[PDB]
Design a protein around this ligand. Sequence first.
Ligand SMILES: O=P(O)(O)O[C@H]1[C@H](OP(=O)(O)O)[C@@H](OP(=O)(O)O)[C@H](OP(=O)(O)O)[C@@H](OP(=O)(O)O)[C@H]1OP(=O)(O)O
Lengths: 150, 201, 134, 73, 112, 97
Amino acid sequence: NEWFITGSNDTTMKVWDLATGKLKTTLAGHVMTVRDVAVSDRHPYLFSVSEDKTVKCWDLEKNQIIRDYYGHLSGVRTVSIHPTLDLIATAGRDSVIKLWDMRTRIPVITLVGHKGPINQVQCTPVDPQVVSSSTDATVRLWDVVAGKTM
Amino acid sequence: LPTNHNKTKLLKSLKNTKYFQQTTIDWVEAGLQLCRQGHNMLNLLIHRKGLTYLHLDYNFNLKPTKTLTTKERKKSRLGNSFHLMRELLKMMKLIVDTHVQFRLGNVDAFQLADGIHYILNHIGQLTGIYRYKYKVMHQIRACKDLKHIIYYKFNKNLGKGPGCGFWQPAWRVWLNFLRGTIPLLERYIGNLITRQFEGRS
Amino acid sequence: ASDLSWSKQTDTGITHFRAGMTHEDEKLIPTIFRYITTWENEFLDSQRVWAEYATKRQEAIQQNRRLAFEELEGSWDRGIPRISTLFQRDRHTLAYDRGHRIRREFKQYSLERNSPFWWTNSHHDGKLWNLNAY
Amino acid sequence: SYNGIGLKSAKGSSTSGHVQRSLASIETHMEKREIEVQVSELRDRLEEEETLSEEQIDKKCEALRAKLTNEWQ
Amino acid sequence: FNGKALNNAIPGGPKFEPLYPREEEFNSIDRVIFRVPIRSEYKVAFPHLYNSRPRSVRIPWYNNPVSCIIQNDEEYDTPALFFDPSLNPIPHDFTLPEDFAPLLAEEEELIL
Amino acid sequence: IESAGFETDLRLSTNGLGMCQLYFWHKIWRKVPGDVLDKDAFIPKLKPAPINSLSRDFVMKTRRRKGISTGGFMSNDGPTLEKYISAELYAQLRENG
RNA sequence: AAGCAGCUUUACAGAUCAAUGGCGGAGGGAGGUCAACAUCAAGAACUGUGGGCCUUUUAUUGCCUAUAGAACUUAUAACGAACAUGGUUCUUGCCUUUUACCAGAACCAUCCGGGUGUUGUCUCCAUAAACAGGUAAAGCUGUCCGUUACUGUGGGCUUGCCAUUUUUUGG
Ligand SMILES: O=P(O)(O)O[C@H]1[C@H](OP(=O)(O)O)[C@@H](OP(=O)(O)O)[C@H](OP(=O)(O)O)[C@@H](OP(=O)(O)O)[C@H]1OP(=O)(O)O
């Protein structure tokens, strides 16, 4: 709780301070509107979905981009770091959640079944491990193993 | 720093199959066979795409047989990868052909060494690798720079003229270039050959 | 070139020379600044040649002769404005031209490609340089 | 930049960067001092030769001082 | 490494980009005694003294002792141990057994 | 003040064979040539000062470091007149003698 | 360091030809452009065994001590006394957009390679090594076999030597 980072439409995430309200740093690696920011719980990372079609990892021991998760078919809207594994859940306009292993930057498990663009994805440590929701008015609960909506 | 858990190598991973076989041949025969096989592989890369009018000469000069369409200039342009293969095989064929002109009895060993030192310090003139990969210019400059040292320590009491054939450090510079662009060409030609067989993702 | 830790402090003498555009040849290409007369060397000369012209005009009024321009040759291309303005073919028309400096200076607010010679006007000042010797 | 003269880089200026060196470049006071010196000398003498008691040396010194004063007007 | 990190040339040495773009009362000519013009060889030799604001500067190897190696360059004519022409000259009962020998008295040859 | 790297000068002139060791245990102190009170001494700015105007230099710049002077002009030395000679008779006798 | 005494050794002359006890043996040496597994960037930094001490139940952490070992690189720090290339981001150049680039940084990587240990295989040269239990591995152990445990010749040295106050020639 030393800080909170607010990604904004001027492409520049800014790291503000809780107790004082000060800037400390500005993270400006995107070129499009930064839509979602998700800081990791057990990693010193900062995953920043923008609509650059890029999911960028920010190493907070360095304040540098280290990983760029390519594979999205359109703009991305949300991150969801699975809190007790090493994968992130990114989904957006292309109506499909791509899970990403954080080491190998591979789309590990595609999650097929939402119709319209997906707005907000949440991950739980126990199945349903992806609680996602889209513009087709469906909150789908996902099986990460089977790849099917439970 | 090199990787420490690299137990895998390239040729050590190819001895352990049933397809490659160990033998002992002359170096000149190995060079002539890599020229023949490189000509066959680049000729088959050309001929799978349908570029049968690009008569890849035996000295690895890609020349169109006839003047082209634009459709026969779109399929017949190729990237830095295929041309980089073509230019390194031009370089290697110049090396092996000067050793052949030695081994045939035509040219002297001193004139072989000067011919090799001419090759390894005129790759940017004799071959054309500078076009398709421009950081080769680094090594080309280094080869020129080694020329500029060696011709004024070989020629203290000799003045100006051909005859210098101390080709060792320029040879090292081009081997270090090949050390750098083995995995580059592995990835480039792996992507090209999987576009030829598997196709575009 | 001079010491860029010292050059932002004092008027350093020109202690070094960085090479401008070196070619492999030793071609000493002449530069335009040597073929343009500098402003002090134009203005002292302008005061001299206009003192000479006002003296020759006072004498030609005293001699009651009209000052033909076969005498001022040699001083025909010296002085700001030029002596060659005084015997151009439209001097009676340009007698009534006033405010031409700012008219030529505010062309940049109404022309898309103004001439870069916004300041000079060869009808009123003449050619202030000659690069046919360059 | 040798001697801090040259460029940051030859790249950027589009020059050769060949930086070459240019071939174109009181009496009373004195008296007092003397008196003091004399006194010191006297004291030293006293110390040297039979003057463990102060009164003697002091007396002699005083006399010397007086003499000096007399000498200087 | 010091010549690279300090934007600084050596006569035999190579030139680089500046590693740091460095721009702009204390160190003005009003307060500087100009006796020794600080050549860049000082700034590479003693890099922390002659440089206001160095960083990423590796500590240079201060000298080895004075190697007084005799070169023996006379036509294979001199022995291995002799007094070289460049060497400066030097301006300065009890009994034992007869068979008490020095150590290595069995061999005569000082050199081989 | 003149040995700012005499050691590297002996090493780079002799191409590495020389060796210099500067030391100050026999604590010798020599007069700088030139007067302190020489206000008519010329002071260059980028080349080093000449010999007969050295000490006037070596005073002044150190004064500008320590704030006892009042700017980068040739005045503000240490005069007799600032310390005690304030009445005009002492000043005129010192300048008239 | 000539010799003698002593100790040890092999070639032995010898006592038993026993029960002993040392040493050596209970399936070799040199290697090879042979590969397989480890291992190689660090509190200057490593493990083996054993004890003891701390969690709220003694579990995975982390220390203090005792000894036996640390091969390989490492200080002008690094497996390599040599040196390429690629990715991301930032800052320059060329600029006419990108690839291809100029060239510096930071963080990462990818390639040519390399060392050491062990296992195995292969090549060349040789040749009481018998039986029984196991492990990831060995004479590891039990039975067992040669010189041989009690003298002398021949070699080696780990030693000593070649009475008059403080030791060994008398209170
Ligand atoms: O033109 P120059 O300035 O006189 O230099 C040339 C040139 O060297 P550069 O590549 O540096 O220009 C030649 O190289 P190429 O023309 O072949 O490219 C080289 O001849 P070789 O490469 O054939 O050896 C020759 O060297 P030399 O004639 O001594 O063999 C050398 O002349 P310099 O020795 O005077 O520099």
